[PDB]
Amino acid sequence: HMEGLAGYVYKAASEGKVLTLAALLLNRSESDIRYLLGYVSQQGGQRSTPLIIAARNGHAKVVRLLLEHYRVQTQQTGTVRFDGYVIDGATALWCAAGAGHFEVVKLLVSHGANVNHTTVTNSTPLRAACFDGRLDIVKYLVENNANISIANKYDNTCLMIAAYKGHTDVVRYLLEQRADPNAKAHCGATALHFAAEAGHIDIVKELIKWRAAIVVNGHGMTPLKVAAESCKADVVELLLSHADCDRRSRIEALELLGASFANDRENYDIIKTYHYLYLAMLERFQDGILEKEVLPPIHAYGNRTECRNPQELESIRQDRDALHMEGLIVRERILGRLLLGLDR
C-alpha cells in the first residue's frame, strides 16, 4: 500500500508539519516523490495535492520545501473549499492569494507560477485577492504582471468585486494602475453600480474621481436608480452632484429614493419619504414644467393616485397612510437580481 503513504504526506502538508513531511519524502525514489507529491486526495469534496492545500492553509515552510527541494510544479490544479462551497481548477497560487497568505504567494510567484491562471470560472489570482481586500497581495501580483483586465465568467472585473466588497484601498490601487472604470458585466453593470447598491461612499468618490461614466444597466438602472432603490441616500446626493440628465432622471432618483424610504422596515422613515418626494415635486414645476405621467389607480392601493401637483402632495405631509401608498405608487411607476458573478 503506497496510496497510504501518499495520505500521510498529504496530512503533513495540510497541517504544516514541515519536519514530519521532510522525513516522509526523504530517501525516496524519483518515481515515488513524483507519485507522492502528485496524488490528488479528497478532504471531503476537496480534491487537492500536498502543494495546493499547504499553500491554501498558509504553511509557507511546507511550500518552500516542496518548491526549493523537490522541484514540484506550480501548475497543479485542484478543487478547494472556500467560504463553504467548492471552487474548481484552482492552482496553489490562487488559494494562497485568496486566503491572504502573502509569504506563500511571494514563494509561488518567485518559482514562476503563472500569475494569470484562471479558475474554471475564469477567476485570476489577482481577482481572489481583491475579494479578500489584501492590497499588499494585489500590489505584488500587479507588479509581477498580473493582468488587471481578466474578468470572470460573467465579465465581472477585479475593480468591480473590489468595489462591491468595500475595499476602498484596493479600488484606488486598481484605478491608479489604470483599471477601466467603465467595464461592464453580462448584465451591463459597471463598478459604480456595485459600489452604489452597497453604499460605499468613499469608493463612489474614487470611481467618479477617475471619470467613471454614468451608464444604463441592461435592466435600465443607472447607478442613481440603484442607489435610490437600495435606499442609499447619501450616495444619491453625491451622484446628483455631477453631470447627470439635467432634470428628467435627476428627479427619477429623488422620487425613487423617497419612495424607497417607505417600502422596507430597514428605513421606513416617512419624514424622509415626504422630503425627497416633495423636493422632486418642486423640481418638476420650474418653467412655463415636467408633468407626471401618472398611471391609473391601482386596485391594491384602494383608489389612491400619485400626486401631480405640489399642493396635492402638500396635503399629505401628515397622514402617513396616504404617503405609504404614495410611496408604493411612486416606486411602481418608476420600476414596474443582477448580482450573479460576485464570488471568488
Residues annotated within the binding site for Zn(2+) are 186-187, 219
Cα→Cα distances 107→51, 67, 119, 128, Å: 12, 8, 20, 17
SS3 89: strand
Nine-digit cell at 127?
481577482
Instruction: Give the CB-side neighbour count of residue 311, counting CA atoms within 13 A.
Output: 0
Beta bridge partners, 90, equal: 78
- Rounded-to-10 torsion of CA 177, 210, 232, 324: -140
Binding-site residues from annotation: 186-187, 219
Within a 10 A sphere around the Cβ of 279, how many other Cβ atoms?
14
Q: Which run of H or of E encompasses 138?
A: helix 135-143
Instruction: Give the CB-side neighbour count of residue 105, counting CA atoms within 13 A.
Output: 26
113 vs 58: CA distance, rounded Å: 16
Nine-digit cell at 205?
468618490
Largest CA distance in the chain: 92
